[PDB]
Symmetry: D2
Subunit: 351 residues, 4 copies
């Protein structure tokens, strides 16, 4: 089979690989729709995942089951499925401790284009079909469903880790796809005021559509000062770090109130470390909790988010700015995420 | 001054009383708009909290500060305020334990028409003004603001105790004002499917307006069976008990899944046993947690809920089906809550 | 093979059943030491979970692995292991929801002598060995290790569900083995005052040994009245329901403070008699949370508990008052639990 | 009156200063026993205090009430009391938000020698006596009681913030007084293995007395490596940072397992900021939660910890290595905390 892989650091291209085979509990799936992610860019041009050879990229996809192992019981060839980017090995001690995302290792739950060929191929492998797949609703637009696989679950997890209270004020730093879902998730957790930080026009409009009551640009001064002016020197209850460099941590700590919570859902791929401003962090005693984690995956997570979409709790269509038709457009779409044109949020390739 | 009070069990009437005076940290407020509650009915006609003599009723109001003690710093005569129904004594060990609703005693945080003269008077007393009042926004309709003082805070608390997860299925038993806010709150906590139980046309319409995806009527069969039918025998993740008799506890336990949560915000009492069905409760080992608590109050809660309204997180105008004017309408409006006509949700009397 | 089973309600006796067969991921284990439980009694003589036929009893055992399936990697023949009484199917949505105890059904995580042949046989079956077994320390007495399988995990779970705070006062209703572990558990969570309820001398000295600061005997007045006198009418922060009839729920509600938590780990007999007292429960608004659940199981739990014992965090030897040898004595031991002598806590049968 | 104050950065000495007077809700207390703290050192020599002039030092004390305001009801002249180092203003929004430690400002709950004259004076002031004092048991040694004021509440808070589970492995970095209580607290939260990091012989013995199952010294290799060796490459569930510099944060992140929790109770008074290692932190998605907070204060906290001591849950005497008699020894005891002789843990001055 043919697949769009990473020939090597800073190098991409199509390669020829043998079709993956399913174990007794797995499934081989063919993509119906896929979407490039900021991670595919990190992994290649930033070596976020060290070096890799002939590895098929991509981890956001909806598709059709074409083959299932003999022990698979809830899925059969022909089924249309939503594939969460995170597909944990459910039989590990990390799962027993309540952290499937790190089953068998840190971030190990995230297999596609991590240490397992991704979805940008004619076919791809899904471990434990019954535990990691969800049926795609009959009338659901492919472009929308693809947003569930990573954008929705990650953004929403940002709001969950933030332990938002009804009426809490929230600042979302970064208004790209993930940050936009962080805003929507924050609203669906009862957030009162929601301040989105970003400037890309199409993103600013989407941020407001999802719930942002205020928008701040870095170009108008220090974000912390801006936030303080909007909150009359009180600061905000919660901060969700969805984009930017390591400097956003320092900003989150400075604008968040003592006893507040900072939730990171941004994948930091550059630099040796992130810095916590001592004074603003109350010298480590201001109860400004710092959290951060990979989006939950698996069947239950996918079905629950899917149902939120079916019940119109969120309109995912506003995330899709570009739609291509044809496997041949994968390279074009991915390169779109690399150059980051100003009118882009997410791109979906419909085979 | 005059005040509409509970002369005794099953006895109402206007009485003459001495105008309360403000202590160093208190405020005397004159009502601008009030609303009768089912709690007033339970307390009077059912004596759900013991006997009372000459106690002015009502605990839902918006008003004008007419006097403050010498130590009050954030409120002054002339300010328009939202008065939360729960006004705790913030200097108590229960507060240090994290339960303001019970400062100095069970339910003692809720004073108005409990053990303190209520708001159905020319003037009423508010303890610790700086900690228990919130400013009324200039453009906010008085009827809507009154819904914050109890309905919104209680309904949302029901959704808070329920510890709802993104996509959780929820059943709200009782779709009166409290249940309606329970529904709205459930949606604002990320609920996917929301099943409302009730039949009054006006309430059914409001339930769907707030987020109900399904409506069930007792006349179509046992509620538990219906819920099992809608869910293909799987039950629901959460249940919020907002209205109905004590038997709804049994229904909640029977329809909720193991590991699920039942949240009570229904002021029980009456004269019917609160029974937990043993088999359905897993003999006490099915992790079906049961919670239930008086709504949070105080300035912070009022300001946070108020801000949600300002940011259009919820439209409270749908709760008000009747608006009257003048003190000489408090009685009629209260009797309306007793007769419970099919066309009533909440009534507000604007003075 | 031979096995002591429940022929049917009120009927017990040795029978010749089929020998369990190990699937690719299971293990066949031969018991080295077992212990009868009150649960066996409820199940047989009370049909608390439903009638059964020729079901081998017992769910508390330590044993030797004699056979493992072809896919088992961490255990092999010859290994001595601690078998937790709760062995969940780890590949289920309940597990994905965070409740292994109810994998594939309410209480379905607890298989042995629930709907699967128990440990009172020449050999027994353990589903998914790699996920449900733990190595037995070389120097750990068999009698002590058997206490980890259910008594320790259940008692500690009551303490966990109780959400005890540093200094919290706690009442443990019932000082049988489960309550004793509830007491030890409470101390190990930071409890200050710990009031144990019971009268058997042997249990009384064990309770104090585990941390009880006060012991209440029924013959000195009703338990609620005693606790209220000991606490000057203030009640206690937490209540763990370990033993007794269904009236203990009401007693727990009556002595727990507003905002308190009731933790049930008592497998309840029959009826529904789980009545909640309206007034003491603040009409459902006193924030008196009621929790209750089946003990956690699986490999991780058994290893974590095992390590607590190895590090002397709790001395399990005080739970064993009777030790017998040989399969023959399984019947004698079990009947001992039915008669509930005053000198018994737990009995262990070493094969 | 006389008081041992800070005459200026890196300057100490006795001074004459006005004796405080009690507000209507305050009390004036005369010290019975006091103890110098590492904070007194940072404040005077590290200037993390933002510098001050003629400020009386000390915040750890037990004493006698000699005067109360007209509105004080639960404490009267002659009462012996435990004074928590943290004495918040209980009437504030931060308290309503659940964070007394920061009422009216970040760390504002800590008043003594922060922005209010400390306890090293003939008399000192306590705001809101009824909410901020606890009665000192008649038979409790003054030296032990003083350890409750900060060491115990802080160390225990580290264990509380760590949200420890029964059997969790815990590493405590720093075995000075605070870390010693972090170890005791961890044990009292059900920790299995507890690894203490320190080298001072007197502290190492104390560490083992309170529950340390292992002791690691920096002089034997990278602490993370040493921990991995003990844990066979799996790391630990929890880490409590109780001593050392900002490098402990990096070590904490590296040794804790994904999904683990890092609890900081160490006052960081040097450096521009603390650094989080990007890779070890899973690029911000390893669910390695970071917490850090000032110890709780107030009457409830003090009574609850006090009762734990009364019920022998922890023996505080092992923290007191030096005992002096006489006000004139405060300077000597304080300098002891500066020079840090090897046989020191905590010094108490009994007036
Ligand atoms: Zn992605
Ligand atoms: Zn009301
Ligand atoms: Zn048992
Ligand atoms: Zn100190």
């Amino acid at each position: 089979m043919k697949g769009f892989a990473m020939l090597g650091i800073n190098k991409l291209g199509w390669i020829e690989k043998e079709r993956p085979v399913a174990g007794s509990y797995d499934a081989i799936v063919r993509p119906l729709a896929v979407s490039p992610c900021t991670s595919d860019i990190h992994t290649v041009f930033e070596g976020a995942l060290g070096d890799r050879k002939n590895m098929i990229l991509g981890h956001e996809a909806v598709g059709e089951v074409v083959e299932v192992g003999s022990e698979v019981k809830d899925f059969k060839p022909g089924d249309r499925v939503i594939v969460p980017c995170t597909t944990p090995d459910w039989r590990s001690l990390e799962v027993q401790a309540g952290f499937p995302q790190h089953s068998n290792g840190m971030l190990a739950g995230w297999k596609f284009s991590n240490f397992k060929d991704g979805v940008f191929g004619e076919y791809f492998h899904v471990n434990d079909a019954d535990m990691n797949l969800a049926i795609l609703p009959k009338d659901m637009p492919l472009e929308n469903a693809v947003m569930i696989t990573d954008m929705m679950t990650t953004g929403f997890h940002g709001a969950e880790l933030a332990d938002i209270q009804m009426g809490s004020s929230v600042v979302v730093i970064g208004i790209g796809a993930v940050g936009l879902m962080g805003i929507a998730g924050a609203k669906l957790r009862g957030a009162g005021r929601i301040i989105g930080v970003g400037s890309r026009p199409i993103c600013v409009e989407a941020a407001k559509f999802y719930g942002a009551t205020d928008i701040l640009n870095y170009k108008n001064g220090h974000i912390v000062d801006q936030v303080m002016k909007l909150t009359n020197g009180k600061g905000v209850d919660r901060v969700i770090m969805a984009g930017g460099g390591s400097e956003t941590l320092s900003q989150a700590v400075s604008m968040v109130k003592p006893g507040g919570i900072i939730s990171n859902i941004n994948y930091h791929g550059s630099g040796d470390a992130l810095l916590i401003p001592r004074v603003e962090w109350g010298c480590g005693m201001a109860h400004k909790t710092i959290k951060g984690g990979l989006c939950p995956g698996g069947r239950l997570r996918a079905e629950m988010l899917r149902d939120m979409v079916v019940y119109n709790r969120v309109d995912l269509s506003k995330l899709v700015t570009h739609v291509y038709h044809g496997f041949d457009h994968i390279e074009e779409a991915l390169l779109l995420m690399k150059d980051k044109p100003k009118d882009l949020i997410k791109a979906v390739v419909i085979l």
